[PDB]
Write an enzyme that holds these catalytic residues in place. Sequence first.
Site, mmCIF file in Angstrom:
data_model
loop_
_atom_site.group_PDB
_atom_site.id
_atom_site.type_symbol
_atom_site.label_atom_id
_atom_site.label_comp_id
_atom_site.label_asym_id
_atom_site.label_seq_id
_atom_site.Cartn_x
_atom_site.Cartn_y
_atom_site.Cartn_z
ATOM 1 N N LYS A 1 -73.064 68.040 -15.915
ATOM 2 C CA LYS A 1 -72.438 68.038 -17.231
ATOM 3 C C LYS A 1 -71.475 69.220 -17.336
ATOM 4 O O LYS A 1 -70.255 69.029 -17.386
ATOM 5 C CB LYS A 1 -73.495 68.090 -18.345
ATOM 6 N N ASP B 1 -75.341 66.242 -30.340
ATOM 7 C CA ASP B 1 -74.200 66.921 -29.729
ATOM 8 C C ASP B 1 -73.687 67.959 -30.732
ATOM 9 O O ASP B 1 -72.814 67.667 -31.551
ATOM 10 C CB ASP B 1 -73.107 65.896 -29.325
ATOM 11 N N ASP C 1 -68.007 67.742 -17.141
ATOM 12 C CA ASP C 1 -67.551 67.380 -18.475
ATOM 13 C C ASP C 1 -66.685 68.492 -19.058
ATOM 14 O O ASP C 1 -65.488 68.292 -19.278
ATOM 15 C CB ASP C 1 -68.752 67.079 -19.375
ATOM 16 N N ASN C 2 -67.268 69.668 -19.299
ATOM 17 C CA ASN C 2 -66.528 70.717 -19.991
ATOM 18 C C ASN C 2 -65.244 71.071 -19.241
ATOM 19 O O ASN C 2 -64.203 71.327 -19.868
ATOM 20 C CB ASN C 2 -67.398 71.971 -20.192
ATOM 21 N N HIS D 1 -62.892 62.990 -23.679
ATOM 22 C CA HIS D 1 -62.886 62.941 -22.234
ATOM 23 C C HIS D 1 -62.889 61.487 -21.771
ATOM 24 O O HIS D 1 -63.372 60.600 -22.482
ATOM 25 C CB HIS D 1 -64.093 63.677 -21.674
ATOM 26 N N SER E 1 -63.699 62.141 -34.641
ATOM 27 C CA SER E 1 -63.950 61.790 -33.245
ATOM 28 C C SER E 1 -64.313 60.327 -33.031
ATOM 29 O O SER E 1 -64.136 59.823 -31.914
ATOM 30 C CB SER E 1 -65.070 62.670 -32.669
ATOM 31 N N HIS F 1 -66.228 73.685 -30.376
ATOM 32 C CA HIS F 1 -66.954 72.639 -31.094
ATOM 33 C C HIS F 1 -66.679 72.652 -32.597
ATOM 34 O O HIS F 1 -66.601 71.588 -33.226
ATOM 35 C CB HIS F 1 -68.449 72.760 -30.852
ATOM 36 N N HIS G 1 -70.053 61.971 -30.718
ATOM 37 C CA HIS G 1 -68.755 61.325 -30.871
ATOM 38 C C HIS G 1 -68.820 59.832 -30.590
ATOM 39 O O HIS G 1 -69.136 59.425 -29.472
ATOM 40 C CB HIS G 1 -67.738 61.970 -29.936
ATOM 41 N N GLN H 1 -77.999 62.386 -20.082
ATOM 42 C CA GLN H 1 -78.624 62.132 -21.381
ATOM 43 C C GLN H 1 -79.707 61.064 -21.276
ATOM 44 O O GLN H 1 -80.825 61.259 -21.770
ATOM 45 C CB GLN H 1 -77.578 61.720 -22.417
ATOM 46 N N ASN I 1 -76.379 70.104 -21.620
ATOM 47 C CA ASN I 1 -75.117 70.782 -21.306
ATOM 48 C C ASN I 1 -75.172 71.525 -19.972
ATOM 49 O O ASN I 1 -74.166 71.585 -19.250
ATOM 50 C CB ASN I 1 -74.714 71.775 -22.400
ATOM 51 N N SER J 1 -72.209 63.017 -17.783
ATOM 52 C CA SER J 1 -72.914 63.614 -18.918
ATOM 53 C C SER J 1 -73.987 62.671 -19.431
ATOM 54 O O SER J 1 -75.150 63.058 -19.597
ATOM 55 C CB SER J 1 -71.942 63.958 -20.053
ATOM 56 N N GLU K 1 -76.186 68.107 -26.198
ATOM 57 C CA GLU K 1 -75.092 67.806 -25.296
ATOM 58 C C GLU K 1 -74.194 69.008 -24.999
ATOM 59 O O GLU K 1 -73.635 69.079 -23.898
ATOM 60 C CB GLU K 1 -74.269 66.641 -25.874
ATOM 61 N N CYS L 1 -61.882 68.425 -20.082
ATOM 62 C CA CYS L 1 -60.917 69.134 -20.919
ATOM 63 C C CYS L 1 -59.623 69.361 -20.169
ATOM 64 O O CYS L 1 -58.548 69.389 -20.781
ATOM 65 C CB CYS L 1 -61.479 70.472 -21.403
ATOM 66 N N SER M 1 -71.230 59.705 -35.493
ATOM 67 C CA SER M 1 -70.419 60.712 -34.829
ATOM 68 C C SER M 1 -70.864 62.118 -35.244
ATOM 69 O O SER M 1 -71.512 62.317 -36.275
ATOM 70 C CB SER M 1 -68.940 60.511 -35.148
HETATM 71 N N1 LIG Z 1 -63.746 69.877 -26.531
HETATM 72 C C1 LIG Z 1 -64.734 69.430 -25.776
HETATM 73 O O1 LIG Z 1 -64.752 68.298 -25.355
HETATM 74 C C2 LIG Z 1 -65.853 70.358 -25.453
HETATM 75 C C3 LIG Z 1 -66.649 70.168 -24.343
HETATM 76 C C4 LIG Z 1 -67.673 71.070 -24.116
HETATM 77 C C5 LIG Z 1 -67.869 72.128 -24.992
HETATM 78 N N2 LIG Z 1 -67.080 72.275 -26.051
HETATM 79 C C6 LIG Z 1 -67.260 73.370 -26.979
HETATM 80 O O2 LIG Z 1 -66.348 74.393 -26.622
HETATM 81 C C7 LIG Z 1 -66.922 75.667 -26.856
HETATM 82 C C8 LIG Z 1 -66.876 76.477 -25.581
HETATM 83 O O3 LIG Z 1 -67.485 75.711 -24.554
HETATM 84 P P1 LIG Z 1 -67.822 76.331 -23.138
HETATM 85 O O4 LIG Z 1 -68.699 75.340 -22.474
HETATM 86 O O5 LIG Z 1 -66.556 76.754 -22.494
HETATM 87 O O6 LIG Z 1 -68.726 77.593 -23.462
HETATM 88 P P2 LIG Z 1 -68.709 78.936 -22.605
HETATM 89 O O7 LIG Z 1 -69.760 79.824 -23.168
HETATM 90 O O8 LIG Z 1 -68.744 78.635 -21.147
HETATM 91 O O9 LIG Z 1 -67.282 79.564 -22.913
HETATM 92 C C9 LIG Z 1 -66.979 80.298 -24.080
HETATM 93 C C10 LIG Z 1 -66.144 81.475 -23.624
HETATM 94 O O10 LIG Z 1 -65.418 82.028 -24.711
HETATM 95 C C11 LIG Z 1 -65.514 83.442 -24.627
HETATM 96 N N3 LIG Z 1 -65.398 84.068 -25.946
HETATM 97 C C12 LIG Z 1 -66.328 84.088 -26.899
HETATM 98 N N4 LIG Z 1 -65.886 84.746 -27.978
HETATM 99 C C13 LIG Z 1 -64.655 85.164 -27.709
HETATM 100 C C14 LIG Z 1 -63.620 85.917 -28.420
HETATM 101 N N5 LIG Z 1 -63.836 86.371 -29.668
HETATM 102 N N6 LIG Z 1 -62.465 86.136 -27.775
HETATM 103 C C15 LIG Z 1 -62.247 85.687 -26.534
HETATM 104 N N7 LIG Z 1 -63.138 84.995 -25.830
HETATM 105 C C16 LIG Z 1 -64.335 84.714 -26.363
HETATM 106 C C17 LIG Z 1 -66.882 83.710 -24.067
HETATM 107 O O11 LIG Z 1 -66.934 84.985 -23.448
HETATM 108 C C18 LIG Z 1 -67.030 82.575 -23.089
HETATM 109 O O12 LIG Z 1 -66.570 82.953 -21.804
HETATM 110 C C19 LIG Z 1 -68.342 75.415 -27.291
HETATM 111 O O13 LIG Z 1 -68.414 75.544 -28.702
HETATM 112 C C20 LIG Z 1 -68.630 74.001 -26.875
HETATM 113 O O14 LIG Z 1 -69.588 73.409 -27.738
HETATM 114 C C21 LIG Z 1 -66.091 71.430 -26.289
#
Ligand SMILES: NC(=O)c1ccc[n+]([C@@H]2O[C@H](COP(=O)([O-])OP(=O)(O)OC[C@H]3O[C@@H](n4cnc5c(N)ncnc54)[C@H](O)[C@@H]3O)[C@@H](O)[C@H]2O)c1
Lengths: 427, 427
Positions: A183, A128, A187-188, A348, A79, A298, A51, A360, A178, A356, A153, A192, A74
């Site tokens: 991180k 990422d 971060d996550n 973020h 983003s 993602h 991003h 990196q 990650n 994070s 990432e 968020c 990006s």
């Molecule tokens: N928006 C952001 O800034 C940001 C930051 C980090 C990660 N992400 C993305 O967000 C997504 C999730 O990130 P995360 O770190 O929380 O991963 P994570 O694995 O910790 O969490 C995903 C959760 O969703 C649950 N899940 C999966 N399939 C499901 C379904 N069909 N129904 C209900 N629950 C379900 C899983 O059991 C898991 O607990 C990833 O794709 C990641 O790349 C986004």
Amino acid sequence: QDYKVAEISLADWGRKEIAIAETEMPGLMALREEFSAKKPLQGARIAGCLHMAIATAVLIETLVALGAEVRWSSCNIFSTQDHAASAIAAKGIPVFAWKGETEEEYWWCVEQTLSGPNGWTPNLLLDDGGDLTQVVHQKHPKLLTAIKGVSEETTTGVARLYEMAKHGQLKIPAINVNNAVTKSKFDNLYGCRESLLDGLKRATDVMIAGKVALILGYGDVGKGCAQALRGQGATVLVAEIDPICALQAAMEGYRVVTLDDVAEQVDIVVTATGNYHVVTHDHMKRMRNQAILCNIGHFDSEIDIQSLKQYQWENIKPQVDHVIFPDGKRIIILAEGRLVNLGCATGHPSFVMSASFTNQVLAQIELFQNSSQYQNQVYVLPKVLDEKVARLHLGRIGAKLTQLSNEQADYIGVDKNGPYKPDHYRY
Amino acid sequence: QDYKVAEISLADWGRKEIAIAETEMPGLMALREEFSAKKPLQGARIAGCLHMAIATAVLIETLVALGAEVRWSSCNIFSTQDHAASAIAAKGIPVFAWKGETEEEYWWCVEQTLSGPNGWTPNLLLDDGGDLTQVVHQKHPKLLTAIKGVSEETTTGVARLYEMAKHGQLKIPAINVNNAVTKSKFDNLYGCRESLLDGLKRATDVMIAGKVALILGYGDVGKGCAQALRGQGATVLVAEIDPICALQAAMEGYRVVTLDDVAEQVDIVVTATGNYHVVTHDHMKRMRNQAILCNIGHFDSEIDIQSLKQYQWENIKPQVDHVIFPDGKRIIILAEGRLVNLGCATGHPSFVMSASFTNQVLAQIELFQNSSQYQNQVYVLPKVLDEKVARLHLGRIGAKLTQLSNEQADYIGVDKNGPYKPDHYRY
Ligand SMILES: NC(=O)c1ccc[n+]([C@@H]2O[C@H](COP(=O)([O-])OP(=O)(O)OC[C@H]3O[C@@H](n4cnc5c(N)ncnc54)[C@H](O)[C@@H]3O)[C@@H](O)[C@H]2O)c1
Ligand SMILES: NC(=O)c1ccc[n+]([C@@H]2O[C@H](COP(=O)([O-])OP(=O)(O)OC[C@H]3O[C@@H](n4cnc5c(N)ncnc54)[C@H](O)[C@@H]3O)[C@@H](O)[C@H]2O)c1
């Protein structure tokens, strides 16, 4: 002009917020202070796919201050912050990013990072979500030969590294950034916690208090999203397939439900599963008029937007659209189902991105100097670096660390200077 | 009478709360339902050393319903619930526990668990904190020969297993129950979130709102303690030696400070470090009159109570004492610095103990049936058992699990039935 931004005139604005962002990002400034003389990244050639935001401009200028050559892009079509991209390009750095790429422009921007003037090749990948990793693995295997490693990432990009390794498709060393505690668990979660609210607010200005909000997924992103909404007075619901995360959510007082059951009851839906088609056509047809639907996972895959192409779309403002069902009932969809926090806001804040991005940079200094020691699997950084990352951020927010005495250190079996936890400590 | 309780007459009362507790402990009831026929623990002889509470009476009766022979004892001189101990003894189960043991009685109670009528020896150890493990390793190495394994309940007992393994002193297989996600991230966190308040309240009835409270330590116990106090309106302060935990606390809005700096400012102090002498004589001398000092870490070691033996002690009620300094300023010390939640209240509620204890039973079925496969190191249970534990508790609190479709399972790389996370997922 080895760049492609939307508007080069925004450079001064970008530079102004970059200066501010440096006072919010002690990790990178401290990394500058430590490594700017030695330049551990002299000779590095980094294809970036992350991003293109103001925080990312600081990470880029930090890799540069450590000697590296980079080309950026990006990893999401919505983003890029344009003034950030503009300030980077004005500094003579090749960057291909702008808010509002088409899918064709997106993959061309990714392609741009893989070659520069006078036969510039990358020996480093900074990715990422796995898109840059897949392009090089599947469309430039002649590039993989000179690549020391990739640092990934995000959770989704790490899962994609794993399926590659599982079918012998991963052909370079890979550092799971990650899953650095500083991180994933920061971060996550805390990022968020702040930028989901931001995205929803800028896009719709909807009141959160009193609304029923459903978080699909209770990983680190879902955990932060739910905190965000509950703190503004929403009733938060949670969906989960993992019984352990389901129990955590239940024990924080959320009701754990299925979308199949509650689709008619929710005012807001946030997908955070990293999964495919967790919001279906029947769900959206059952949703109430003006229900807000957004994706913070993602990939857009999480909602079946294909199943809405039949219907008429009416645009409200950029990245805010209505889908009109035949009975005239309308759904509000943010950013056409792409990352709502980065798509409808600014991602973020810089401070948590600093943790994070310090991870990196460390992983780039490490992949660039000791890649021989690594195979074609996925690895994480040592705990003592994880602790150093956190240590660099304590000062900004005024947290004072207690010092172990010799005997306290012996009492719990650690060195005074860390590491302080066994490898599999979960924090 | 192969038992030693304070008052056998409390058996009916104990039985009444045990019946209630079974409706709060679905994990053990479900384990009963599954394994009661087969009796996987027939032939097992378990020396128990774990807080003799009502929840523990259910765990004991569950191991029995699975065929095992046991002798029990508390692991804290103030933690036994007497009516619970009484109801166990009335059922013909040897138990040596009562609230208010002296140190000599405590170690004699531990000794009782190691031998029973007609040459009864243990082949199993179930230990919470390492005391039973150390007694057998250092004073009955003739016992270690017939011992299949020990399952350790708590962080401090696990650290003691590690120093043993590090100096080649660990001579049996050992299962780290504490680090089952459904123990550590539940028992230590959500249980202390509830029973610290309980302990403080029963002991002093002090208002929490408006008080400055200092948590030394921000692990899972500290994290729950801080949530507890902040939710009742205390200003919470946190001390840490680990920069990662320090940053988590700072990012949840707590000020991270040192006791050296703030000893004069705190109304309440909770030690949660698992460490030695983190509250010193100079700290307590600097504390304000009627400051409340308590320990929720495993051992009294955390406060230097020796340095208060000079001064006069005035007892307020059981486990609630004043220490009077020469200038007439008084400190309130709970349970003479032993576990405040179990010492001044009833420990964690039965529901979260059910997740811990389901992990314990599983580890006993596993240590009893496959100990050959394990060496003299420490191990944790498989993730699929961790998930089963959580799954057994979803029903009680009405959390409904979403089911992955075949394609969703493939999309994220998991089997429909789990495990759902990579091994080092931190939750
Ligand atoms: N928006 C952001 O800034 C940001 C930051 C980090 C990660 N992400 C993305 O967000 C997504 C999730 O990130 P995360 O770190 O929380 O991963 P994570 O694995 O910790 O969490 C995903 C959760 O969703 C649950 N899940 C999966 N399939 C499901 C379904 N069909 N129904 C209900 N629950 C379900 C899983 O059991 C898991 O607990 C990833 O794709 C990641 O790349 C986004
Ligand atoms: N009361 C209960 O019911 C209960 C439940 C579980 C564990 N415990 C006990 O509580 C103790 C801590 O448990 P935990 O699971 O949180 O362990 P943990 O390792 O997760 O947490 C201990 C924390 O204290 C910090 N710390 C250590 N020394 C310190 C010092 N001198 N100053 C400041 N901080 C310091 C460590 O950095 C660590 O973060 C253990 O002894 C454990 O056996 C008690």
